[PDB]
């Protein structure tokens, strides 16, 4: 896991285009009309993790291996969803425990552009100030009515929850982790996608894009579902299904 066959190159608002294929766990969630409304991450051939608030159902399709969603020549996999496991502790008013698991009806075929991100242990310690990466097809400018076709990326620091509360106060819960306020921001269409940090050389899923400033302000932090606080539920969901 977490070792892309195509190496990402790091120099979403004020991000940059990803190297094509370099985030091979990044999937698109698309409705029946082919419209991207959320992102997700492959954690193995059979499961995708995304945000609970996205409201994914079995009528949505998981799209793996895309870089340019405006292209018709990329070798992409359109993967039907057999079952949705929305975390029952997800609170649609507090947006806490914002995680959902998607069981694919057929297994993904891993390749150079499709593979899994690593999951952390519930005890892993990802230090405030660590530079991590988030990717997605969300707005590159809040005023836009047009997401980008090409997968974007940005580097950004993790915050402590203590410092994050100085922005968002009692909205911040233990199952949340904040990143950004550094000149970049997740934005609409990024939800459900990954916030990854490189642990022992392997990109590891530390957060799931969740919420933040309504205008995607680059001077306030984005808030992510804290995967360490949710990963035992992920592992146990997989073990049971």
């Amino acid at each position: 896991c977490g070792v892309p066959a195509i190496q990402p190159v790091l120099s979403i608002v004020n991000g940059e285009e990803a190297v094509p294929g370099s985030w091979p766990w990044q999937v698109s969630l698309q409705d029946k009309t082919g419209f991207h409304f959320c992102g997700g991450s492959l954690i193995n051939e059979n499961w995708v993790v995304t945000a609970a608030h996205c409201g994914v159902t079995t009528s949505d399709v998981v799209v793996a291996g895309e870089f340019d969603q405006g292209s018709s020549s990329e070798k992409i996999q359109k993967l039907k969803i057999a079952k949705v496991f929305k975390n029952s502790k997800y609170n649609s008013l507090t947006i806490n425990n914002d995680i959902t698991l998607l069981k694919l009806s057929t297994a993904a075929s891993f390749s150079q552009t499709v593979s899994a991100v690593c999951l952390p242990s519930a005890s892993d310690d990802f230090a405030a100030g660590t530079t991590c990466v988030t990717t997605g097809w969300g707005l590159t400018r809040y005023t836009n009515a047009n997401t980008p076709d090409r997968l974007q990326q940005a580097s950004l620091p993790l915050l402590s929850n203590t410092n994050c509360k100085k922005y968002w106060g009692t909205k911040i819960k233990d199952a949340m982790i904040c990143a950004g306020a550094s000149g970049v921001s997740s934005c609409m269409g990024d939800s459900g996608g990954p916030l990854v940090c490189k642990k022992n050389g392997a990109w590891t899923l530390v957060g799931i894009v969740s919420w933040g400033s309504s205008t995607c302000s680059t001077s306030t932090p984005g808030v992510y579902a804290r995967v360490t606080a949710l990963v035992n539920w992920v592992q146990q969901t997989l073990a049971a299904n």
Partner: protein
């Protein structure tokens, strides 16, 4: 569009200080000063303001016709 908020969680304080929990898609309340949204399409947005008053509860009372 004029102000309104259905659920108004006013708290312990004098003068009051209140908090609206209404979920609105796309954007918040026109008079909200600080708005948060999920980064989905459509975004699910909330107003995190704290005012010492509530706006009219959006929905009418529907209780003035029957004697």
């Amino acid at each position: 569009s004029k102000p309104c908020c259905d659920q108004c969680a006013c708290t312990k304080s004098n003068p009051p200080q209140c908090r609206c929990s209404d979920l609105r898609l796309n954007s918040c309340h026109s008079a909200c000063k600080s708005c948060i949204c999920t980064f989905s399409i459509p975004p699910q947005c909330f107003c995190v303001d704290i005012t010492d008053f509530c706006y009219e509860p959006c929905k009418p009372s529907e209780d003035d016709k029957e004697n």
